[PDB]
Symmetry: C3
Amino acid sequence: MADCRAVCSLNTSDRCDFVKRNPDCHSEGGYLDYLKGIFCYFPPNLLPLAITLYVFWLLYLFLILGVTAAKFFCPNLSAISTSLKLSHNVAGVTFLAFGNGAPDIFSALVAFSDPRTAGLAIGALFGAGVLVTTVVAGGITILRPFMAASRPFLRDITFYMVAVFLTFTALYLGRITLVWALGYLGLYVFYVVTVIICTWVYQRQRSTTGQILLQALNPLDYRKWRTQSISCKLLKVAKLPVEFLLLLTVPVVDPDKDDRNWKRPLNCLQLVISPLVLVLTLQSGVYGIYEIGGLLPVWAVVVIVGTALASVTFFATSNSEPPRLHWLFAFLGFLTSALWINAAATEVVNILRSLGVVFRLSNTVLGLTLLAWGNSIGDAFSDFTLARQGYPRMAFSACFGGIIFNILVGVGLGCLLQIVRSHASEVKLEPDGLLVWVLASALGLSLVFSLVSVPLQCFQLSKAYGLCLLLFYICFIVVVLLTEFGVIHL
Amino acid sequence: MADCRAVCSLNTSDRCDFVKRNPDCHSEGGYLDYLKGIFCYFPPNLLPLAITLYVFWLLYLFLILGVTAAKFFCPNLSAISTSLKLSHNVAGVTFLAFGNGAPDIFSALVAFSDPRTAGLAIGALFGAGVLVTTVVAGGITILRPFMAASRPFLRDITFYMVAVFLTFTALYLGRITLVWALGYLGLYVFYVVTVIICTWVYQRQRSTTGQILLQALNPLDYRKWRTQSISCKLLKVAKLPVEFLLLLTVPVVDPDKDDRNWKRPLNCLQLVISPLVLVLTLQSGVYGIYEIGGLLPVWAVVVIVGTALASVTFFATSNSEPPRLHWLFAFLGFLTSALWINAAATEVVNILRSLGVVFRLSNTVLGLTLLAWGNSIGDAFSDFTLARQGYPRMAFSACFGGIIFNILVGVGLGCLLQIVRSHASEVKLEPDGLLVWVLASALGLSLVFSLVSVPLQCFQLSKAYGLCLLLFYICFIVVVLLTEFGVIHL
Amino acid sequence: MADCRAVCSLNTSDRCDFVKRNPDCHSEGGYLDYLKGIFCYFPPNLLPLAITLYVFWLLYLFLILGVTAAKFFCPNLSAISTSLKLSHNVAGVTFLAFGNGAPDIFSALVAFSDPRTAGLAIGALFGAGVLVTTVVAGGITILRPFMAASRPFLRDITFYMVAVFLTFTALYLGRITLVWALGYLGLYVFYVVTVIICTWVYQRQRSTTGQILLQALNPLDYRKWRTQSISCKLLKVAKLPVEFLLLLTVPVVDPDKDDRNWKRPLNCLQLVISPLVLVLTLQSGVYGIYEIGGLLPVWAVVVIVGTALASVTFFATSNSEPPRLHWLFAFLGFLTSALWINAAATEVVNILRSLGVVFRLSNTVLGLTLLAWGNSIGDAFSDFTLARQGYPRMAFSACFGGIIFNILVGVGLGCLLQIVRSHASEVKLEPDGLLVWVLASALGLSLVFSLVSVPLQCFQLSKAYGLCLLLFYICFIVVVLLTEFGVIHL
């Protein structure tokens, strides 16, 4: 079984056949085989043509994540937070945490499925934790200075430190048993229960149709369209199709407007469209193709129920006033929106992974540097967007809550599933070199620096904190890159 | 002669006898031993519980240093500074320097008594210097931004750099003679004389009884007691006994009040209590028990003289007006207060040292770290408290004056005493590894960074300076810890 | 051929003869042989007194660069910028860039003349780039906070990154051909053309005699002279001769005054003095003595033409009103002033080089530490002075424009001249150790940190950016020094 990279040294005539019968280059989770397109479709003598196009494609992806987070994800999450009268810390700890941590948990599971890649998975988790706790927090503090909550910050950082030290001990022992995974799950459940109980205790003390449908689906404001410059007009033309598709798919609820963005026919159609998208997209449509008893597919029952509910709500409410349950739509407008993030992020990885092969690079770098960046690009986008809109407290609290979520839930679930499926009494962790311990030391240093600096700063997070964190991360990345290339021997 | 740690692998029945028979399991400073209590006094099984108790004890110690510095040390020192019309720089250079540097000098002497531990002593001095010049200054600048005096800062940093480079040369030569120690003493005397002369030259240019006694000893304000929360009430109850004892022992003079905290009967009793405490505590009752000619003990003459003076001042002054020499009491209220710091700090070390055995570590690096932290914990407390109260200039100047004091006086006195006692022509310094030179390079880097940054900042010390110093110290500590564990081979 | 340093171990009687017949450790550029003066002139038994004198001399040099930049260079450059209505970015990109980069280009040429020193030359270029991009920018931001232009900053940093990566690739290949040098020259020409075109496009969118001569040459204001303190008076007395000489030599044009500093007789004499100085200075007289086919010397024609022009302008204008071409004088008042910088900087190097020969100074590294500092001392002085006067944008833009200038033009011209003179098809670059790659990684890290930080800061360059850069540079210098002395083995 020759390596996949050997297709580069193999004759151009047989490269496509080698790919068709070569494994170790068929990552999934995406939708398009990029290596296949490079090596079989586009003219063999235009290698670069596909390349530059892909680069452009990559840039287009960074536009999509720029829009979905700016217009639909953050406003829906803010409406959810306002409707339930939740504090910023609680919302950041639970909702943004789940939305930013689901892909990381899925990647951790798919990596823990193979005992060989357990070290790669734990290293990727540590790298993502380092990146989020340093660079995301730094940008959050720099973009919008603010004052953080003292008690929730101390509580969250203490819980995160406990979780990190438990993971450190588990890695040092080189093995994880059933008891460890059960303890991780119990610790996360206890953290959530403590959040809810403390928040509750603190809360007690203070005491025609068609034209409106076409207009709602029009993303172009002609009055605004007329006054833009040439570059702005071109950017708007580029953004138009994806914006129209997202408007068609993702509902939005904004409490800042008197009408609360109520578009009765559009919302009724979305009540059918969004669940269908969810079932047809989750797990790449495995549940969509699933048949209930071999007679009725899941998607058919889904569309039937959606159409029934849409007809009921169409005949139940009027155009003038939005129903009292309108905020529930925001929940849907959240969930689907989060999905529109995740898939996009996956595609970004499918870019970085592939082009990489063109220039064979070390996994001691591909799996630890680029994989964590691809996993946390959605978190970075969402946190920066929320910081710009005017909610720094929530994003800053999520910056630790989400990472606690990934570490605890991902490690525990992966270990439990590996134990149950393989019927093994333990899962063995193989430490691949000293780079894992370097990552661990960097994470510990970042956590200690934050815990020492923020209370000493009287909880007024200025820009110097973020700038110093940025310097630290850049220096750490440079040190790691120098170590991998053999310049520094440890 | 087996190592003391071997008591851990030895049978539980003979552990107490093993501790008793070996004098090396003994530490001089503490009023109370700890390893003996862990082994013999406690039930062998309840080993964790006792440990937790000690942890609690440690926390209680951090409370004591929190009170003595906040209520008695800093106000007395401020009254002393105001009475003599001294500038902030002068007071920080002399008085706070002596008060924060006496334990470091004592430790340096007790370490230089043994030629083997000379390298450990010089490394501890360098580590304490690094910690004070970086972390203490960083916290001082972060807690309260201010504008520092340019000329005294430049003078102090130049003198400190000269002293550090002289120590560097002495260490490189690997030997210290009588001439070197005499030069160190002469340099410190010249520094003090220059301070006095320059300060003098500048200003010339600019041109019933019982009820009051019981009330003075009551630390509880009932009106204030009623309005505190449950946690605050519990904290006050915990602080009450030590506060009462300190009020009984340490006089305080506050010029901010009209009466200047004049409690005539309490002060008269303190005039006898404080000297008795000084003689009975200094050198662990060493001078404490000595007898004058074998007939009259020192403490008896002390109490006789104190009672005579107390009777004289009782019959000499009235309750209405405080005597013109009242500020002299502040001097006493300073000295005893400083002692109340030092002993406490020692106890903290007796915690860190001990528990260490149970989970021993690398004394080579640890001696350098935990020992310096224990020595400088009092300096850190005093400087942070003074910065909070509103005197950043004085603490910032002390941050260099005190370290000049420790380096010069400790090294010179240790070398002189070792030469005189052992009748040797020189004292040999053995460089233990490259970690000493790493410490030296870190100290030099910190000094160069300060000397380049502060003048370039127009002497307006902001928070970024301290935050950057904190990052530097954390990174340096992480690098040292990684080097000691064999991850990085030099 | 024994090394020059061997003169130190050789007998004092033959040291001067050895120097007279010693070809190594020598260099030409200044107007003095410092080693000859140390080892032959001053009494052989007074090694130190003379050394101290040189130290004083060095300090005097730092005074000269302090005056010429403060009084004549920056005001003339500001007048040039104001007269042509140039933006700050354009002026910093072209004029200050040439003035600060001419000596670096000359040193790069004189180093590329020898194929052995190509690695030393490229390392010196990288070190100067690192120092300017970090420390100079840090001081510029700290001394005067400001808001930078976004688009020119992004453009300049992108061009600099492209140039640095091209140099990285050329060094990795270990060879430079004619095509590479021609591409470097074409890239610099394209950069200049893009600057001019973009700048042009933007603005289109917005749409008796004797007494006055003696008074002009008097640098002492008696009214101001009377009120200074003793130290200030001594400093003024020390500065008087060089100030008088510079007033005699360098014309100055200040648009802030109504008369625009018009001194008709002094300017007429300067019209002859300045060109004569230029011809009989640059190239240390190299073109200085060449003859016109023996028909006449160049200096004679120069003084004849200067006297003719001076007579014409003397008979052409009056004392009351300055001519419309007066701003052209500023151009001259710029160029000669820049020369008064360059020579001084060279002398500084002739200090550092020499005293160093006395010591066992290194070169592998030192040739890159002290040489870059000596080359960029003029740039640092000019940028700090311009930042103090109130033009931070121009100096900050020059901080990248000038370095682009040195890298591109110096490398291209050196390679082209070496190829043409030696008739070789390529120039071979020998990488001397890993320190060159360490320098490259440091430069890349600094550039990445700037490109990530400045846009994230909303282009409001505060003091924390500069302070963090200063910390980074100090740490990097300490790491390099530790690596060279064998403490850290790579």
